[PDB]
Design a protein around this ligand. Structure first.
Ligand SMILES: CC(=O)SCCNC(=O)CCNC(=O)[C@H](O)C(C)(C)COP(=O)(O)OP(=O)(O)OC[C@H]1O[C@@H](n2cnc3c(N)ncnc32)[C@H](O)[C@@H]1OP(=O)(O)O
Ligand SMILES: CC(=O)SCCNC(=O)CCNC(=O)[C@H](O)C(C)(C)COP(=O)(O)OP(=O)(O)OC[C@H]1O[C@@H](n2cnc3c(N)ncnc32)[C@H](O)[C@@H]1OP(=O)(O)O
Ligand SMILES: CC(=O)SCCNC(=O)CCNC(=O)[C@H](O)C(C)(C)COP(=O)(O)OP(=O)(O)OC[C@H]1O[C@@H](n2cnc3c(N)ncnc32)[C@H](O)[C@@H]1OP(=O)(O)O
Ligand SMILES: [Ca+2]
Ligand SMILES: [Ca+2]
Ligand SMILES: [Ca+2]
Ligand SMILES: [Ca+2]
Lengths: 458, 458, 458
């Protein structure tokens, strides 16, 4: 009943990239993927994506729910659609034709397109829009009774026709039956090589079959991306849309025009986001937590009541009430327990940290299983690499790891123990003990008067 | 002679917050507080704020110069004003009626509103504005001679009336006498429960008493905040206004559209601010200092000629010529003396630092009284916590604190002394002495050929 | 044949700066310098800049290709041009008159101005533009046949004339001969002190000599900067222009409206720039490298395939495939070899680092010649200062510098050697050896039950 054809073979030369045009990301996912999301809104019985060069790459990535045909030669949009013939020829119903480079179009607009089509039982329906600078776009010609007669390109347009402000977005709905029919009719009697999807509209004009146009109230929603300038504009519209949705859902933004949140990030209500925060991938933020300017989060989970201050968190888990930063880096596979505190210049990598534990400064915790109520003094380092292998360090509950100490794994610091500040630990420390591995202080009276820094020597 | 009534009881359901709508901040202070600031511009003999739910909270915070009446039930704006009757009934004069959720209105606009009122000796004056999308707003109906006849809501508006572009901002000036009179007249003969402030305009129409409207030249100044989307817009307008004011006052902004400066921050002329800088609360910046992208300052004082590079400064004092950052954190109750230098990855907490002293890297200084011309080598740590209590460290003038040393308080390093790099200091170091607490170096020939990192073993 | 006169003596009082108005920067260089760049587009046989106060300063800086005359008194634009008389009087040809405070005008617009001039063989040509708020600007009066009759200031304009939307940008092309002629004719018979460049247009009106106006299609291109508000606007237009140019050239921007790239930065295609990145001065970025939010680069070279994560790089060289950050600081005169890795909280100053070497954390490397495949454990510090002099450290290939070690220069760590974590190195370490300078660990059973942090004591 409903079928979809997505054109993704284009030659994105103005992109100046080796990556197939439609694979370029917009807020987390590729333009193609956004098109797949709006397309799904019309519940197409079949979905066929036409890819061109590097065809393998596009497929090798998003093998999403969609058939895949290849267009080895650049013979135009008509030929691209013709490549879906083997799969859609014969079937009766409505077929959506959309480009993979117009990611701003919405599922809602696509639904209205079909409804508008089936409604007037048109043979073909053109998704159109209006602008005051239609230069370059095919124009939409209608009769005094406002019926879509045909589409006129800029090069063929009469002076009088250049005045038309309604343009063709390049998105269409065709009755699948007539469509492939008209595609062979143009292909064979073409007296030329390349044919275009708009050539089918020319045929319906020759035969008088009903063709209509649904207009998009927002012209900017029809943007076709051809270069990194339109790319940025796409990014900008999608950003406003994502952020508008969160604000309506109860999230505060100091500046939603400069906050970068990917398409799939989930944010509980009452969260507060300062300007210039970055949320990427599969990220979740719980209720009332606070994200300050600079925070950067990727594929992570943050609980409720947390305060993330200018810090970078990657593939990690952060419980409720956790405070992080400023300038902290939480690396892959880390888990911070409830009320944990990670202060400035602290790095946590592949480590579980129990609740209420704190590492407030200039610290590195890697490959450690850390307990609850632990204390890391400023300067502490967990050494877990010898140039070939990594080793694990186990730290019990309530351990007091003295400042500037060097913990050389594999070792265990038992519960309630303490490592003297400035110590190098090479062996296990039993529970309730203290470990000290540092030289004893020695004073040399008057010796400083004999060194470069002394006032007497400058 | 002049009285003010501020409506702050509203049910901000679209805000999706537990915090009373008007308490949500906009550039440092709550919307209510901005309204109190514009209201003060008309020197009201009395100011009464009507609060609703959580009434205690709004009051418990800004017990600012203003009477407080409570509206326990949601019976409309008319009933809310009726709650101020005990306090304003009888008094003669002009009474301003304003919402606590329209924080962009200015004191200047409010003054022009009253003057326009007293001028034409109107009984009531409507603060209006113009827009091309008046859908939803009450319209302002005037006669062929441009006199305000009445206000018409959207639901009652005739097709012909929907065309009116002048809308009601919900701000008004009433002759206090007639106002409460008309409020009882509607209340009793209401034949309904809730009555609205606009019902009083209906009565003056019935009686023919003169009603006028002062139009705001800037429509965006009338924004009523109902959700976090308008919240963000408020933040955006107020930000442009604050920043415009500083630029006119001689401050350079690389991008004033993305620089966040609270309402009360003071900035001397010739200061240079890069994009994405944050100034909050009671912050002061002296002449010619430079703030680079990322700098974040809260309730602090910075002198003239300073250079703050991507650093966070909180509740502290920073003298003239000080250089901080990149990535430095100056925490509560710190004071940096003239020409002091705090470099990358350095934390200073509750400490006074004398002039020309330097801590250029990976350093923590907490609870210290530090002298002038001191030098902290990279890696230094002042240890001031044992898990229960904090201790103080006193460091004289010209001390050279060697890199990677660990200073365990409570201790004193006397003038011109030096602590050997990599030392753990547990006792006082007399003036002019040197202290060393580190193991002596030992070399083991060929031993490395026997370890994982060696080329021979990989 | 073509001559240029740049007016740079103005009294930029609304700037509130001690620095001559035209010296204020816009995207890396001064407004004056941007004007010199557009001016060069018309290949002027001679270029003369009129400077006023602090005349020495403007010259003492950009002694660029241009004659320099001084205007000691503020007698108007006419007098300023009159100061170029000694140098341009007599010569025949077209003379461009432009202000040093209109930096957005383009060389292309300037070329079109001259062509439009020489074309109609006009005596004088006025560079004009159109806007809907011409209040304050001199208006352009034309006859029913659209010929430039004269310029009318706002104060003299008739009501009917205030309607004119075409305004004078203050940029002109005059036939050098008549120009100085008309300048003496006004100067002597002036019956007043100060004369203005627009007075020459008045004379051509008296004599009927042909005067024309070339209109700028973009009004915003004519901005005259007088205060830091227009300054910011200039910065904003120039930023969009620079960034538009890179996007067209194949560079991706997450938000080109909030990315700050100086006028002279070079960026290879396929580079990806996140929002809020800063590129200043002579900076070069190679193909496909990635710059994340916060990165700040000044006068540096970055190769291809690099990933710079929220880090600051100054006057340094960075090879291909290098990864830096987050929160790393690469200081002046550093060179990172191919595939080098500098992680979080690491500082590199005046040091060469060989390929594949890594310093992933909390590390300071200053004044070192470091080899290839070296490894710096977290916490390492190279000590190179004694309060008076700096010393160099030489580190061979494949050295393993243990965590928390303190390397006191001048020393050498030979190839494949290893420094034990937590060691203080005061002497050379031969190749293939290991060096250890740390106290041995000692455990005291039960001692912790006797300290403040222990659960038993709280
Ligand atoms: C900067 C921040 O983040 S702040 C929070 C971090 N806080 C910290 O890191 C503080 C940690 N505190 C320390 O390291 C302290 O120096 C402590 C807790 C080890 C001092 O403990 P004390 O028991 O009071 O010191 P004391 O000198 O008596 O030493 C205890 C035992 O160890 C021995 N000892 C002391 N120093 C050494 C040493 N360098 N080598 C070997 N043994 C030593 C003593 O001989 C004594 O043993 P004994 O009883 O058999 O004679
Ligand atoms: C990374 C940056 O920010 S850079 C700037 C920071 N700069 C620094 O931190 C540099 C600090 N410098 C140091 O620590 C040096 O090693 C210094 C200044 C202590 C070296 O001083 P020197 O006097 O030249 O060394 P020297 O070996 O002679 O030692 C002096 C005395 O201490 C003794 N001593 C040396 N090492 C030790 C030790 N580990 N334990 C006990 N005593 C020691 C010596 O026996 C000698 O005493 P004596 O005269 O009674 O025999
Ligand atoms: C946090 C990160 O970035 S992770 C990556 C960084 N990784 C690191 O920094 C790890 C570095 N590793 C170390 O420092 C380790 O403690 C190592 C490599 C020195 C341990 O080496 P090992 O040889 O296994 O230890 P071992 O105890 O046998 O000591 C070797 C020799 O030094 C001696 N020695 C050990 N400790 C000391 C000491 N404190 N003082 C003097 N000599 C010592 C031993 O007596 C022995 O000599 P001998 O053979 O003549 O008796
Ligand atoms: Ca297109
Ligand atoms: Ca409202
Ligand atoms: Ca250290
Ligand atoms: Ca001007």
């Amino acid at each position: 009943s409903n079928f979809a054809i997505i054109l993704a073979a284009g030659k994105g030369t103005r992109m100046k990239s080796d990556l197939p045009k439609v694979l370029h990301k917009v807020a987390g996912i590729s333009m193609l993927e956004h098109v797949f999301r709006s397309v799904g809104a019309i519940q197409p019985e079949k979905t066929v994506t036409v890819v061109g060069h590097k065809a393998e790459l596009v497929e090798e990535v998003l093998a999403g729910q969609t058939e895949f045909v290849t267009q080895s030669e650049q013979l135009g949009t008509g030929h691209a659609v013709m490549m879906t013939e083997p799969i859609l020829e014969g079937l009766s119903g409505h077929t959506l034709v959309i480009a993979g480079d117009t990611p701003l179009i919405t599922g809602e607009s696509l639904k209205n397109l079909i409804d508008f089509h089936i409604n007037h039982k048109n043979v073909a329906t053109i998704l159109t829009a209006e602008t005051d600078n239609p230069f370059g776009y095919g124009r939409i010609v209608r009769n005094d009774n406002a019926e879509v007669l045909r589409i006129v390109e800029q090069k063929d347009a009469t002076d009088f026709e250049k005045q038309i402000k309604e343009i063709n977005t390049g998105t269409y709905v065709f009755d699948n039956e007539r469509l492939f029919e008209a595609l062979k009719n143009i292909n064979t009697n073409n007296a030329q090589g390349e044919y275009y999807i708009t050539d089918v509209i020319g045929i319906f004009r020759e035969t008088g079959e009903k063709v209509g146009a649904y207009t998009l109230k927002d012209f900017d929603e029809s943007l076709g991306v051809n270069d990194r300038v339109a790319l940025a504009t796409a990014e900008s519209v999608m950003r406003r849309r994502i952020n508008h949705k969160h604000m309506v859902n109860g999230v505060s933004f100091v500046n939603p025009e400069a906050t970068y949140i990917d398409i799939d990030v989930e944010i509980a209500p009452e969260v507060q986001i300062e300007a210039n925060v970055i949320l990427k991938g599969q990220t979740k933020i719980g209720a009332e937590t606070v994200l300050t300017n600079g925070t950067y989060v990727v594929d992570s989970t943050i609980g409720a009541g947390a305060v993330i201050t200018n810090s970078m968190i990657e593939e990690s888990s952060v419980a409720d009430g956790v405070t992080v930063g400023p300038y902290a880096h939480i690396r892959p596979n880390s888990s911070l327990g409830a009320q944990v505190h990670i202060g400035n210049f602290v790095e946590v990598k592949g480590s579980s940290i129990g609740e209420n534990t704190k590492a407030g400064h200039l610290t590195y915790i890697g490959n450690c299983e850390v307990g609850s109520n632990v204390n890391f003094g400023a300067g502490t380092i967990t050494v877990n690499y010898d140039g070939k292998n990594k080793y694990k360090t186990v730290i019990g509950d309530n351990v007091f790891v003295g400042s500037n100490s060097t913990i050389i794994a594999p070792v265990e610091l038992g519960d309630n123990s303490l490592v003297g500040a400035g110590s190098t630990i090479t062996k296990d420390v039993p529970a309730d003990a203290i470990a000290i591995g540092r030289g004893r202080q020695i004073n040399k009276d008057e010796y400083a008067t004999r060194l470069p820094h002394h006032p007497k020597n400058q």
